Amino acid sequence: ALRGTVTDFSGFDGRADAEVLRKAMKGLGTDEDSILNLLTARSNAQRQQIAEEFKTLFGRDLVNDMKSELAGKFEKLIVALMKPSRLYDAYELKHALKGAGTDEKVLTEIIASRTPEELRAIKQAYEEEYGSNLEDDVVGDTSGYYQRMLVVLLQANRDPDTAIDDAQVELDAQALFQAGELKWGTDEEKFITILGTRSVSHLRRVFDKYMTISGFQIEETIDRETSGNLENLLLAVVKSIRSIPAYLAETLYYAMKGAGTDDHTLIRVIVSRSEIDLFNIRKEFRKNFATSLYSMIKGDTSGDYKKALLLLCGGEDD
Ligand SMILES: [Ca+2]
Ligand SMILES: [Ca+2]
Ligand SMILES: [Ca+2]
Ligand SMILES: [Ca+2]
Ligand SMILES: [Ca+2]
């Protein structure tokens, strides 16, 4: 079902490639082209082996050498590509929190689209890497029901997918109806519990029954009933429940649709999803936005940056 755009290289030789990267950096200037062409053709696993051979061959640190040679978004793109998979989300999260400011957009985006299984691993990796509890970090940096919704999600305790119980579907749709539209105010607590913990297959039926019952799609009520980060969060959750690929295909489009580009988001979704479901994200981007992801990056980016992005992404037509 899920398909990424980057796979393991067939005639892979970690040593052969490490020497190519060395020649490509040794001397005056850089062959950014040989780097980008090499690195976006190996899986993340292979990039780690290559980084290993390099150290053992030259006693130098690949990532630190690149940081020296490259600059701008390209550097940032290659540095994210070098990050081990099991660590990247953890890394992005820690970087969204830390500092005097928080990038709720990152928190929301990652915590809402990742599965319980992925949340668990992300929680481990975070603690072993920065020696901090992820939850404790989030709690400390957020508040309100937004914080609560994130913590509910960080539990990665979403109910399992079993045979759907109609009566139970009816009950949940009517409860959301009473918690929001039929209420003077909102019972955010009921939305959080039902959206945060019910099984995916169950909530998809609840979303449909709720439309039938209210004349509204859950998204419109959320927008009607809530505001700020909590709104964004819940929209995020509802969207991922319906389809992670589509939700990610959407946060990408809005990163570029605007005049400039949000390179940070553009880099994070393509890199993080390159070997999971970036192929699915592409289809859903064409269907829903009429253009292929390719063509879109092709016009919003440039330089080697643009060159690497397009190779990782691939597919002119989608
Ligand atoms: Ca050099
Ligand atoms: Ca630099
Ligand atoms: Ca209301
Ligand atoms: Ca609103
Ligand atoms: Ca643009």
Instruction: Give DSSP secondary structure letters for the chain.
Output: ----S----TT--HHHHHHHHHHTTSSSS--HHHHHHHHTTS-HHHHHHHHHHHHHHHS--HHHHHHHH--HHHHHHHHHHHS-HHHHHHHHHHHHHSSSS--HHHHHHHHHHS-HHHHHHHHHHHHHHHSS-HHHHHHHH--HHHHHHHHHHHTT-PPP--S--HHHHHHHHHHHHHHTTTSSS--HHHHHHHHHHS-HHHHHHHHHHHHHHHSS-HHHHHHHH--THHHHHHHHHHHHHH-HHHHHHHHHHHHHSSSS--HHHHHHHHHHHTTTTHHHHHHHHHHHHSS-HHHHHHHH--HHHHHHHHHHH--TT-
Please name the method used to determine this structure: X-ray
Ligand having the closest approach to the CA of 30: 1
Distance 299 CA to ligand 5 centre (A): 7
Ligand having the closest approach to the CA of 66: 2
Topology (CATH level 3) of domain 84-157: Annexin V; domain 1 (1.10.220)
Resolution to one decimal, Å: 2.1
Identify the architecture of domain 11-83 in CATH.
Orthogonal Bundle (1.10)
Distance 34 CA to ligand 4 centre (A): 47
Distance 303 CA to ligand 1 centre (A): 19
Distance 288 CA to ligand 1 centre (A): 44
Ligand having the closest approach to the CA of 229: 4
Residue ranges of the chain that CATH labels 1.10.220.10: 11-83, 84-157, 158-243, 244-315
Ligand having the closest approach to the CA of 255: 5
Distance 19 CA to ligand 2 centre (A): 21
CATH class of the domain whose range is 244-315: mainly alpha
Topology (CATH level 3) of domain 158-243: Annexin V; domain 1 (1.10.220)
Distance 169 CA to ligand 3 centre (A): 21
Distance 2 CA to ligand 4 centre (A): 32
CA atoms within 13 A on the CB side of 7: 6
